[PDB]
Design a protein around this ligand. Structure first.
Ligand SMILES: [Mg+2]
Ligand SMILES: [Mg+2]
Ligand SMILES: [Mg+2]
Ligand SMILES: [Mg+2]
Ligand SMILES: [Mg+2]
Ligand SMILES: [Mg+2]
Ligand SMILES: [Mg+2]
Ligand SMILES: [Mg+2]
Lengths: 385, 385, 385, 385
């Protein structure tokens, strides 16, 4: 199960470069030169890297250091063939963003957040990114009175509309993807789930420029079914990007490598992405645990891609299995895909078989045969099939 | 804290009428005649009742029993002045709905679900309901392969569009509200949160006919901030109805009386509903615990309204407190309400105070004063103020 | 992966016999004659059945019906070779237990609960059960004032001590196992986790007569690591019995078939049970989903045993893998098993290599190599190894 | 509601001294001199401070800097009258503890952890601490194979037994308290709940030297009822210490000030502590949110004590209310405190009123009147009474 750049696996600089500082511990690893990470990730079979502006250009760099850093990075991209499909802004690390970026109560911080973002959009376009991700990790509150949510949504809409105006006025061909997270580092974060972000996009001035970048661990921190949420995003035509990792239930954001955490959900996710023809990057946003040295970092990063490829195999085997296709018909997955009432309202109303002469007890008695279907999915996942 | 019909408190027949059957226990209470519940609820200060078709008309009733039941109910409404602002369909109790109603895999069940619903819409209009609620409690799955979610969303859209066609073709003045629930009785339920339902409505043929009916306990079963979700629904203009109860964290749907469960959240919810001018019914969907006899049932139902009125008082006191308004300005809630960039994109770009000459360290050093504001909210809630 | 009676797989009568009534739905299946379940389970490879008194003898049966029911059951056991390793009392279904059995506030109910239990202990001994399970499903509260927990623990200790006196005075060779559950059907249940039950047993008069019967789904309803809890029970010498099923995170008690839910946890559990030499019954407490007809019921029950056997295989392969044993040494699992200070306190104090001359920075720099070890566990689980 | 030193309110140096570094953000506050915190906390009405060795003495200090730091601290304690009732060891910040202290896989780290602890025990005794707290925050695992839990419990028992030997051999009058936490910073932490720690203590060589130090937010991170767990610890005679803060459900450890989070639970906790006569320190382990400047830090710390005192008032009012005492008798809290069977086993067996002639239907029909009792508890909490 060896990854190729055609698998579109991408990594953030901040993932393998995480020094292992957590709320209760100091770094267990020295910092990684982005040039060294680009080269190590290319050797592992990755297709591309992503970056926050602050990952690449240390905060407060002069314009001459800034261009020196870009030029070094650009050399590493050119030496390796690595792409940069996605860029994002760090609006969460610096103390100035402690109440958020786009929805900070302080207006001058909101304007600074927009300028910091716009600067990096120019740079992202320059580096060829086609998706610009926005993770409002500091947008939210620990207490109810700290944030009027309707005002914050106004400010959030205003920020995203202005970003959309700037993109179309520059004639840039780049789209935005909102990354939801229900909590941490804020007590509650605005647009907490895929659903909340999808609803929000429909109120923007140019909705067609915005989609979602859902993350496995984030929806699972709310106990939600991450495959279900992805299906709805696809149904809406709004899955612009996706973040893969693992999470062991409702607790702090663990950012385990993909496939760790809820293994059955990872299987159903890959089944959905592959069967829907999702063609975006397969992005890993994970943290090698701080127990690990650099050898463990690359091992964890390899395991990300490996577990995707294994699950991709098992899902395809499951869908191609004639006994599964038989069981799918046994549970009437075929009838689920048919229109309830293509004959239209009036025909439905006059159809006495739909109500007056419907045998309710016969229909109730029919088994759905879901457990046999699920055990076949299990057998396939486990390679007992 | 005595409720009046002007408080628009409403109860489902199924709430006070719950016999106390749970997954592990038999009924602890005899069944309630709906006529007796209408009369008891009117004596408690309720404004109205709601019903599932099956609450009012026993399943499979002849057309003559059906009209006898309506006529008895109509007499109780006329004798008490109770209104019926909202009606809904039971698409979950009968075994025939075990895989759902609108998204059942079986097409004939889907058509039956639509006819069962349409019949009750006629009856709801007759009884004067202005909101028709849809809770897809059986729509979903315990296993990943049982339901193609994109197909189910198609079938769900199709059902709701047809309902919208039937309403507009009949010239009915009634709107629909989708009630989300993340799980139980299904392992995962479709449209699991307020966000997911809001996004879904934007894809219907006549979006203006559909809103949400969020329920406290349901969003909290996903660990979400229920006040935040309500704010987004209001921001969208889609809060058509609301269900009030209590819930002690992420576990089974407890349907505790309102104010039980997360007390601080109940306070912030009432603060939001009152300050936004929400004018719909204050509907209680709760279950008097099965430890209780009928005296405990009415006691629990009284406590629902009482806790709303107490919290309504404390929220208003909080918002009217000049020291709170001062603290709100101290945490820049006023600046949050101002446009980030009413001067427009180009002016923002040329504004060197927004970036080139922005003192990031000065802005970072400013405290948000959120903890003092929250302790004032606490003092008010507790009547220590 | 075919089960044999030597695998010690056991099922409750109430598991396959669940009619599919849930909080929101009526039965979807007719009731099962216990004699028919005993015969069907024997054909599936089960080793034994368990029962609540009320599963076997309908509540309130005359002494002549009671013995007729036992005699019919005894015939089915004799015709099939099925054993009854475990029996338990239903102290939760009848409305009289709505506030509990052993810790009901009403004393006459507590005495009735003890007599109901003692009667069934006699019957369990007669049928040869060696473990008597107690699941205090109604012991607890929805509200804080309803139950003084210290008093309830007194009443719980008193009940269990008296049960222990009755057993030793009758010269019965039977032991008790407490089954913890954190919630549902009560808002919070007493002795909510394995830990709470283990602590409680140490205060009983004859602690040696009592152990725990942990259940997968129950500890996971608290987000706990079920393998970890089982290890502690084993460490204490108190794992008398175990209940296997599946659960998808913190929500209502799903009682999915074993292997569904958290698949990686099921793998680590089987690894622990097998490597510790657990020799008790492998008991399945699960509910075939109500979507299923009787064919789906037996399919689900077969899947229980199958998933255990598959996981048992993969765990053994993992532990026997020399590259795993190498990786285990690489992460110092061997050093974890050695005494920290077998040289004793004074030697440790005088050992300057333990502190004064300990190279803290060298030790910190060592990687734990946990991620490589976990990916090997993953590969084995997935049959990619 | 002004605190006095007789209220026994204590704070960790690390609480008010938290610089606001979280997983996603840099410090928002400069470091606090412990001498300045001791003085500020004394002005707020605190009774005492607690410390990790590393809070007080910077890691790796010479013996001359070490005594200079103690001497400065000792001067601040002497100038203010502040006590040090509890001390603890930092076995979690330094990278060397990344796999734990007492249960690190590496033996030399385990010995170093014991020496680091023993050194601070001497210092704690010198400063007069009577409780030594152990929070095994790094003891546990992110993956199943990384830690054999039975071995780790052996190593944990060994460490605590040796600590007990050292204490009794030195003739120190100090006791140990284990602080449980279910997760974070490890994926799962050993001894995850109060129950797990209580069970563990019963296997130590000198159990009488060890109790628990439970923390509000920690048990709530597992969805458990923190008042219930405290009652069991009291019942066991093992509540040696307690940590107070707030937590909004199952998510990352928020360390909100006490009274924030689950307000009703905080009320029931104070009711229990006061009615049981708990006489230990009321210790706050919380973090002023990083949105706050130093003014917000002291405001948050004041709010801790204030919310305890308010709740203490409301609980006492509730218990002294004759209508509550009446309602308590109505729900048979009095009968719960009586022995089920003080007449003994044989008398119970011969008592036909306990079974043969017990009217089960009469007893079932009795209401528990729990909802009226809970609404009275609510009214008292809210000051609507
Ligand atoms: Mg994450
Ligand atoms: Mg991400
Ligand atoms: Mg509900
Ligand atoms: Mg509802
Ligand atoms: Mg269960
Ligand atoms: Mg069980
Ligand atoms: Mg904490
Ligand atoms: Mg603590």
């Amino acid at each position: 199960y060896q990854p190729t750049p055609e698998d579109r696996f991408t990594f953030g600089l901040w993932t393998v470069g995480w020094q292992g500082r957590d709320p209760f511990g100091d770094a267990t690893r020295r910092a990684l030169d982005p040039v060294e990470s680009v080269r190590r990730l290319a050797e592992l079979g990755a297709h591309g890297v992503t970056f926050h502006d602050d990952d690449l250009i240390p905060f407060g760099s002069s314009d001459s250091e800034r261009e020196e850093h870009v030029k070094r990075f650009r050399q590493a991209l050119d030496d390796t063939g690595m792409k940069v499909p996605m860029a994002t802004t760090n609006l969460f690390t610096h103390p100035v963003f402690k109440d958020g970026g786009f929805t900070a109560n302080d207006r001058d911080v909101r304007r600074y957040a927009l300028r910091k973002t716009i600067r990096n959009i120019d740079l992202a376009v320059e580096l060829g990114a086609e998706t610009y991700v926005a993770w409002g990790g500091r947008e939210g509150a620990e207490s109810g009175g700290a944030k009027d949510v309707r005002d914050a949504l106004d400010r959030m809409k205003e920020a995203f509309d202005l970003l959309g105006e700037y993109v179309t006025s520059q004639g840039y061909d780049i789209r935005f993807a909102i990354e939801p997270k229900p909590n941490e580092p804020r007590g509650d974060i605005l647009l907490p789930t895929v659903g909340h972000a999808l609803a929000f996009i429909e109120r923007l001035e140019r909705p067609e420029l915005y989609g979602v970048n859902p993350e496995v661990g984030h929806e699972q921190m709310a106990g939600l079914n991450f495959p279900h949420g992805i299906a709805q995003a696809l149904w809406a035509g709004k899955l612009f990007h996706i973040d893969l990792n693992g999470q062991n239930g409702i607790k702090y954001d663990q950012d385990l490598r993909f496939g760790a955490g809820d293994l059955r959900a990872a299987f159903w996710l890959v089944d959905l992405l592959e069967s829907a023809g999702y063609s975006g990057p397969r992005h890993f946003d994970f943290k090698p645990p701080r127990t690990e040295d650099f050898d463990g970092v690359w091992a964890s990063a390899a395991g990300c891609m490996r577990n995707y490829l294994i699950l991709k195999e098992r899902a395809a085997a499951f869908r191609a299995d004639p006994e599964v296709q038989e069981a799918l018909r046994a549970s009437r997955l075929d009838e689920l895909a048919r229109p309830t009432a293509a004959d239209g309202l009036q025909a439905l109303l006059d159809d006495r078989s739909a109500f007056e002469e419907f045998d309710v007890d016969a229909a109730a008695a029919r088994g759905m045969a879901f457990e046999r279907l699920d055990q076949l999915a299990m057998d396939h996942l486990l390679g007992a099939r």
